[PDB]
Design an enzyme around this catalytic site. Structure first.
Site, PDB file in Angstrom:
ATOM      1  CD  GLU A   1      25.570 105.748   2.041  1.00 20.20           C
ATOM      2  OE1 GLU A   1      25.915 104.857   2.990  1.00 20.20           O
ATOM      3  OE2 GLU A   1      26.493 106.695   2.203  1.00 20.20           O
TER       4      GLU A   1
ATOM      5  CB  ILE B   1      20.659 110.602  -5.490  1.00 20.18           C
ATOM      6  CG1 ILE B   1      20.620 111.220  -6.751  1.00 20.18           C
ATOM      7  CG2 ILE B   1      19.246 110.654  -4.788  1.00 20.18           C
ATOM      8  CD1 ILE B   1      19.898 110.324  -7.922  1.00 20.18           C
TER       9      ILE B   1
ATOM     10  CE1 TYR C   1      18.561 103.171  -0.675  1.00 17.93           C
ATOM     11  CE2 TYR C   1      19.678 102.550  -2.590  1.00 17.93           C
ATOM     12  CZ  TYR C   1      19.171 103.733  -1.879  1.00 17.93           C
ATOM     13  OH  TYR C   1      19.457 104.898  -2.109  1.00 17.93           O
TER      14      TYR C   1
ATOM     15  CB  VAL D   1      20.558 105.418  -5.677  1.00 22.20           C
ATOM     16  CG1 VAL D   1      20.049 106.621  -4.559  1.00 22.20           C
ATOM     17  CG2 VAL D   1      19.924 105.959  -6.921  1.00 22.20           C
TER      18      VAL D   1
ATOM     19  CG  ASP E   1       7.542  98.189   1.863  1.00 23.27           C
ATOM     20  OD1 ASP E   1       6.939  98.597   2.660  1.00 23.27           O
ATOM     21  OD2 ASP E   1       8.860  98.312   1.654  1.00 23.27           O
TER      22      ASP E   1
HETATM   23  C1  LIG Z   1      17.534  95.713   2.088  1.00 25.07           C
HETATM   24  O1  LIG Z   1      16.969  96.542   0.954  1.00 25.07           O
HETATM   25  C2  LIG Z   1      17.210  96.106  -0.256  1.00 25.07           C
HETATM   26  C3  LIG Z   1      18.260  95.196  -0.737  1.00 25.07           C
HETATM   27  C4  LIG Z   1      18.056  94.724  -2.069  1.00 25.07           C
HETATM   28  F1  LIG Z   1      18.894  93.822  -2.450  1.00 25.07           F
HETATM   29  C5  LIG Z   1      17.493  95.372  -2.976  1.00 25.07           C
HETATM   30  C6  LIG Z   1      16.398  96.507  -2.649  1.00 25.07           C
HETATM   31  C7  LIG Z   1      15.757  97.112  -3.880  1.00 25.07           C
HETATM   32  C8  LIG Z   1      14.508  96.086  -4.228  1.00 25.07           C
HETATM   33  O2  LIG Z   1      13.717  95.711  -3.069  1.00 25.07           O
HETATM   34  N1  LIG Z   1      15.129  98.243  -3.188  1.00 25.07           N
HETATM   35  C9  LIG Z   1      15.483  99.514  -3.693  1.00 25.07           C
HETATM   36  O3  LIG Z   1      16.173  99.796  -4.729  1.00 25.07           O
HETATM   37  C10 LIG Z   1      14.535 100.628  -3.126  1.00 25.07           C
HETATM   38  C11 LIG Z   1      14.651 100.672  -1.571  1.00 25.07           C
HETATM   39  N2  LIG Z   1      14.799 101.992  -3.568  1.00 25.07           N
HETATM   40  C12 LIG Z   1      15.927 103.090  -3.043  1.00 25.07           C
HETATM   41  C13 LIG Z   1      15.979 103.982  -4.134  1.00 25.07           C
HETATM   42  C14 LIG Z   1      16.421 105.085  -4.198  1.00 25.07           C
HETATM   43  C15 LIG Z   1      16.465 106.063  -5.366  1.00 25.07           C
HETATM   44  C16 LIG Z   1      15.502 105.570  -6.328  1.00 25.07           C
HETATM   45  C17 LIG Z   1      15.497 106.387  -7.449  1.00 25.07           C
HETATM   46  N3  LIG Z   1      15.546 107.665  -7.275  1.00 25.07           N
HETATM   47  C18 LIG Z   1      15.469 108.776  -8.185  1.00 25.07           C
HETATM   48  N4  LIG Z   1      15.692 110.057  -7.739  1.00 25.07           N
HETATM   49  C19 LIG Z   1      15.699 110.524  -6.474  1.00 25.07           C
HETATM   50  C20 LIG Z   1      15.607 110.240  -5.435  1.00 25.07           C
HETATM   51  N5  LIG Z   1      15.820 111.037  -4.262  1.00 25.07           N
HETATM   52  N6  LIG Z   1      16.363 112.200  -5.209  1.00 25.07           N
HETATM   53  C21 LIG Z   1      16.749 113.437  -4.534  1.00 25.07           C
HETATM   54  N7  LIG Z   1      16.262 111.992  -6.382  1.00 25.07           N
HETATM   55  N8  LIG Z   1      15.030 108.655  -9.385  1.00 25.07           N
HETATM   56  C22 LIG Z   1      15.207 107.149  -9.869  1.00 25.07           C
HETATM   57  C23 LIG Z   1      15.262 106.215  -8.685  1.00 25.07           C
HETATM   58 CL1  LIG Z   1      15.125 104.410  -9.135  1.00 25.07          CL
HETATM   59  C24 LIG Z   1      14.760 104.363  -6.201  1.00 25.07           C
HETATM   60  C25 LIG Z   1      14.963 103.604  -5.051  1.00 25.07           C
HETATM   61  C26 LIG Z   1      14.299 102.266  -4.772  1.00 25.07           C
HETATM   62  O4  LIG Z   1      13.514 101.628  -5.569  1.00 25.07           O
HETATM   63  C27 LIG Z   1      16.321  96.687  -1.401  1.00 25.07           C
END
Ligand SMILES: COc1cc(F)cc([C@@H](CO)NC(=O)[C@@H](C)N2Cc3ccc(-c4nc(Nc5cnn(C)n5)ncc4Cl)cc3C2=O)c1
Length: 342
Positions: free
Chosen positions: A23, A21, A26, A29, A139
């Site tokens: 990068e 999906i 973080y 994914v 945020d």
């Molecule tokens: C330096 O930074 C970090 C260091 C860390 F050690 C930890 C983190 C953590 C906590 O702070 N932060 C995140 O993980 C944030 C940045 N994101 C990125 C992320 C991508 C995808 C989805 C998602 N996406 C989808 N679907 C989707 C998205 N795009 N498409 C086409 N489909 N579904 C379900 C989901 Cl959980 C969710 C997230 C999310 O929460 C950050």
């Protein structure tokens, strides 16, 4: 193990048929088929253990998301990591799969007024829950708003969240970096640590403005530019508002600026619903004490088609991480133990 664009994903046997999906800093994914619930899920591979700040975000997100349960807030369904601290190098967080995010969506799609209204409702409904737990997200931005193919919205990324602490909010001038720059309230640059609920309301206001035009309303080119953009639209703060800023460096900076008039919302947003612009005004109030609160915002005429306090639930109860990254790894290990067989 399956490989996704260079990285290993140690998620089997339960999760298979992985597809990239995204990068970012973080991690990475993927979507993956869950062989237990027979549904595709999202899995994010986080590799935080060399960076105290990554460990802080990972621990905060995990602790918060495990406790929270709300339709407009992304869950954690499972966490995969090694059976021992010594072998643990990565944490995989499994969450409900969503189709896209509001940042991606606003790059490509015009939103109808009905879509704007429905999205803002779900943001505020989720935020009501978060704030009712005495938590600040800190945020909120389009990329942290996840959407599915039927436009259901879920708030994500609770790694920058704090418990609210309004007696300890005061600080000096040009100190703080709370939030992502375009969504950061004026008081962050002036005299605020971002420990009050009004910080999140500002970000929501910025989100609303951006839904109206698909363009960020306060696109500061760098840190210092951000207040220029805000005052450019809001105009000079009033004497009363200025007098609330007791710090002399902040007050005298503002006093040094030439008089600037308010740019009227109806001129920035000539196609917008007049009720949307009334609510926008109230969310983008300069003085955080005068800024609308989440429950008042839900009650605003713009959202009358959705407003239903009995269907806008609150948390069952309210919810020191100045710790070394080795200690934070232990706490992450303990916090993820419930997803191991045992
Ligand atoms: C330096 O930074 C970090 C260091 C860390 F050690 C930890 C983190 C953590 C906590 O702070 N932060 C995140 O993980 C944030 C940045 N994101 C990125 C992320 C991508 C995808 C989805 C998602 N996406 C989808 N679907 C989707 C998205 N795009 N498409 C086409 N489909 N579904 C379900 C989901 Cl959980 C969710 C997230 C999310 O929460 C950050």
């Amino acid at each position: 193990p399956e490989m996704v664009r260079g990285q290993v994903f140690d998620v089997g046997p339960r999760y298979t048929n992985l597809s990239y999906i995204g990068e970012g800093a973080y991690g990475m994914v993927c979507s993956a088929y869950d062989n237990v619930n027979k549904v595709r899920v999202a899995i994010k591979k986080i590799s935080p253990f060399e960076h105290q700040t990554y460990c802080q975000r990972t621990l905060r997100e995990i602790k918060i998301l495990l406790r929270f349960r709300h339709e407009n807030i992304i869950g954690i369904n499972d966490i995969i990591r090694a059976p021992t601290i010594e072998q643990m190098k990565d944490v995989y967080i499994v969450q409900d799969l969503m189709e896209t995010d509001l940042y991606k969506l606003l790059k490509t799609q015009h939103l109808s007024n009905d879509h704007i209204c429905y999205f803002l409702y779900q943001i505020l409904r989720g935020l009501k829950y978060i704030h009712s737990a005495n938590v600040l997200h800190r945020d909120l931005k389009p990329s942290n708003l996840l959407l599915n193919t039927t436009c259901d919205l879920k708030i994500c990324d609770f790694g920058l969240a704090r418990v609210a602490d309004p007696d300890h909010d005061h600080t000096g001038f040009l100190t703080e970096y709370v939030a992502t720059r375009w969504y950061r309230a004026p008081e962050i640059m002036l005299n605020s640590k971002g420990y009050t609920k009004s910080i999140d309301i500002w970000s929501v206001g910025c989100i609303l403005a951006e839904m109206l035009s698909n363009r960020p309303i306060f696109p500061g080119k760098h840190y210092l530019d951000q207040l220029n953009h805000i005052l450019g639209i809001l105009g000079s703060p009033s004497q009363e508002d200025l007098n609330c800023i007791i710090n002399l460096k902040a007050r005298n900076y503002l006093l040094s600026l030439p008089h600037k008039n308010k740019v009227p919302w109806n001129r920035l947003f000539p196609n917008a619903d007049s009720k949307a612009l009334d609510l926008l005004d109230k969310m983008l109030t300069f003085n955080p004490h005068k800024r609308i609160e989440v429950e008042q915002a839900l009650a605003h005429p713009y959202l009358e088609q959705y407003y239903d306090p009995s269907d806008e639930p609150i948390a069952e109860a309210p919810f020191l991480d100045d710790l070394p990254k080795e200690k934070l790894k232990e706490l992450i290990f303990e916090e993820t133990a419930r997803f191991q067989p045992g």
